[PDB]
Design a protein around this motif. Structure first.
Motif, PDB file in Angstrom:
ATOM      1  N   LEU A   6       0.822  -1.203   0.000  1.00  0.00           N
ATOM      2  CA  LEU A   6       0.000   0.000   0.000  1.00  0.00           C
ATOM      3  C   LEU A   6       0.857   1.254   0.000  1.00  0.00           C
ATOM      4  O   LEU A   6       1.886   1.313   0.671  1.00  0.00           O
ATOM      5  N   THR A   7       0.424   2.258  -0.753  1.00  0.00           N
ATOM      6  CA  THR A   7       1.077   3.558  -0.784  1.00  0.00           C
ATOM      7  C   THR A   7       0.133   4.600  -0.206  1.00  0.00           C
ATOM      8  O   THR A   7      -1.040   4.661  -0.588  1.00  0.00           O
ATOM      9  N   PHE A   8       0.646   5.410   0.724  1.00  0.00           N
ATOM     10  CA  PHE A   8      -0.176   6.452   1.329  1.00  0.00           C
ATOM     11  C   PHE A   8      -0.637   7.458   0.285  1.00  0.00           C
ATOM     12  O   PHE A   8      -1.788   7.910   0.314  1.00  0.00           O
ATOM     13  N   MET A  11      -3.219   5.810  -1.267  1.00  0.00           N
ATOM     14  CA  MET A  11      -4.341   5.881  -0.340  1.00  0.00           C
ATOM     15  C   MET A  11      -4.954   7.274  -0.325  1.00  0.00           C
ATOM     16  O   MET A  11      -6.180   7.419  -0.305  1.00  0.00           O
ATOM     17  N   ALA A  12      -4.116   8.314  -0.342  1.00  0.00           N
ATOM     18  CA  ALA A  12      -4.632   9.680  -0.338  1.00  0.00           C
ATOM     19  C   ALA A  12      -5.421   9.980  -1.606  1.00  0.00           C
ATOM     20  O   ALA A  12      -6.503  10.576  -1.546  1.00  0.00           O
ATOM     21  N   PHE A  15      -8.704   8.136  -1.481  1.00  0.00           N
ATOM     22  CA  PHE A  15      -9.606   8.795  -0.544  1.00  0.00           C
ATOM     23  C   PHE A  15     -10.204  10.058  -1.150  1.00  0.00           C
ATOM     24  O   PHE A  15     -11.403  10.314  -1.005  1.00  0.00           O
ATOM     25  N   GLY A  25     -22.612  11.816  -5.344  1.00  0.00           N
ATOM     26  CA  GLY A  25     -23.748  10.935  -5.128  1.00  0.00           C
ATOM     27  C   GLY A  25     -24.751  11.498  -4.138  1.00  0.00           C
ATOM     28  O   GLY A  25     -25.961  11.355  -4.323  1.00  0.00           O
ATOM     29  N   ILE A  29     -28.563  12.379  -4.915  1.00  0.00           N
ATOM     30  CA  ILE A  29     -29.658  11.851  -4.106  1.00  0.00           C
ATOM     31  C   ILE A  29     -30.571  12.979  -3.646  1.00  0.00           C
ATOM     32  O   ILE A  29     -31.800  12.851  -3.672  1.00  0.00           O
TER      33      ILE A  29
ATOM     34  N   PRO B  14       1.606  -3.847   4.599  1.00  0.00           N
ATOM     35  CA  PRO B  14       1.517  -2.405   4.877  1.00  0.00           C
ATOM     36  C   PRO B  14       0.515  -2.045   5.966  1.00  0.00           C
ATOM     37  O   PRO B  14       0.391  -0.872   6.334  1.00  0.00           O
ATOM     38  N   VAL B  19      -0.613   4.417   7.318  1.00  0.00           N
ATOM     39  CA  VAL B  19      -0.655   4.760   5.901  1.00  0.00           C
ATOM     40  C   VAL B  19      -2.031   4.431   5.341  1.00  0.00           C
ATOM     41  O   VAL B  19      -2.762   5.321   4.891  1.00  0.00           O
ATOM     42  N   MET B  23      -6.792   6.078   5.289  1.00  0.00           N
ATOM     43  CA  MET B  23      -7.662   5.888   4.134  1.00  0.00           C
ATOM     44  C   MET B  23      -8.856   5.012   4.485  1.00  0.00           C
ATOM     45  O   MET B  23      -9.984   5.288   4.062  1.00  0.00           O
ATOM     46  N   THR B  68     -29.559   5.710  -5.169  1.00  0.00           N
ATOM     47  CA  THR B  68     -28.338   6.328  -4.660  1.00  0.00           C
ATOM     48  C   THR B  68     -27.552   5.349  -3.801  1.00  0.00           C
ATOM     49  O   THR B  68     -26.315   5.357  -3.807  1.00  0.00           O
ATOM     50  N   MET B  72     -23.672   4.384  -4.550  1.00  0.00           N
ATOM     51  CA  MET B  72     -22.614   4.443  -3.547  1.00  0.00           C
ATOM     52  C   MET B  72     -22.013   3.065  -3.309  1.00  0.00           C
ATOM     53  O   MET B  72     -20.803   2.939  -3.093  1.00  0.00           O
ATOM     54  N   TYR B  87      -3.159  -4.432  -3.333  1.00  0.00           N
ATOM     55  CA  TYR B  87      -2.487  -5.257  -2.335  1.00  0.00           C
ATOM     56  C   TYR B  87      -1.897  -6.515  -2.955  1.00  0.00           C
ATOM     57  O   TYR B  87      -0.785  -6.924  -2.599  1.00  0.00           O
ATOM     58  N   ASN B  90       1.188  -5.387  -4.711  1.00  0.00           N
ATOM     59  CA  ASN B  90       2.253  -5.046  -3.775  1.00  0.00           C
ATOM     60  C   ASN B  90       2.889  -6.294  -3.176  1.00  0.00           C
ATOM     61  O   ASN B  90       4.113  -6.360  -3.022  1.00  0.00           O
TER      62      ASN B  90
END
Lengths: 39, 132
Positions: A6-8, A11-12, A15, A25, A29, B14, B19, B23, B68, B72, B87, B90
């Motif tokens: 995993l890479t932050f 991940m960033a 996110f 969404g 809605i 990880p 990290v 997330m 909706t 999602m 993963y 990795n």
């Protein structure tokens, strides 16, 4: 002879993209609920 | 050494760090917020959905509400499968690398004071009237 030393970002980015998609969404809605209340 | 020596790195995933934890927390918060928004029991079903379509949908957690909610769920599933693919990639990349650094790292580190005391008597095959 001493050694001081995993890479932050993945991940960033995931996110941030997920947050943008979720905001879109939620807005969709809300708009759909408003339209359905009028239709 | 007798045979192949490598580092399995079983716990070196990880995870157990800060990290992917942030997330995961952000994604869980977004999913819960979206579930609450689409709500316009529920807590248990929401927890089941959060735990389910993160690891795998291989469990009965089916409980959709609206369009909706489906959108999602699709976005969250896309993120989850992207995470699973990342993963797997990795861990395969870690399998590409290897670690065979050292075993003793010292000419008098621990055993070379009393090999009997250490327990294994490492052979001392020097040469008569030599140099070493």
């Amino acid at each position: 002879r001493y050694q001081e030393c995993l890479t932050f970002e993945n991940m960033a980015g995931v996110f941030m993209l997920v947050a943008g998609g979720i905001v879109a969404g939620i807005f969709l809605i809300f708009i759909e609920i408003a339209y359905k209340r009028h239709k | 050494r007798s045979n192949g020596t490598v580092s399995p790195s079983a716990f070196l995933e990880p995870f157990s760090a800060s990290v992917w934890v942030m997330m995961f927390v952000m994604l869980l918060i977004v999913s819960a917020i979206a579930v609450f928004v689409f709500e316009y029991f529920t807590i248990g079903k929401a927890i089941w959905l959060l735990w389910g379509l993160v690891f795998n949908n291989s469990v009965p957690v089916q409980n959709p509400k609206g369009t909706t909610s489906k959108i999602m769920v699709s976005v969250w599933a896309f993120f989850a499968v992207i995470f699973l693919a990342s993963y797997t990639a990795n861990l395969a990349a870690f399998m590409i690398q290897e670690e065979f650094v050292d075993q003793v790292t010292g000419l008098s580190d621990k055993k070379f004071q009393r090999p009997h005391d250490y327990s294994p008597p490492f052979r001392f095959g020097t040469v008569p009237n030599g140099s070493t």
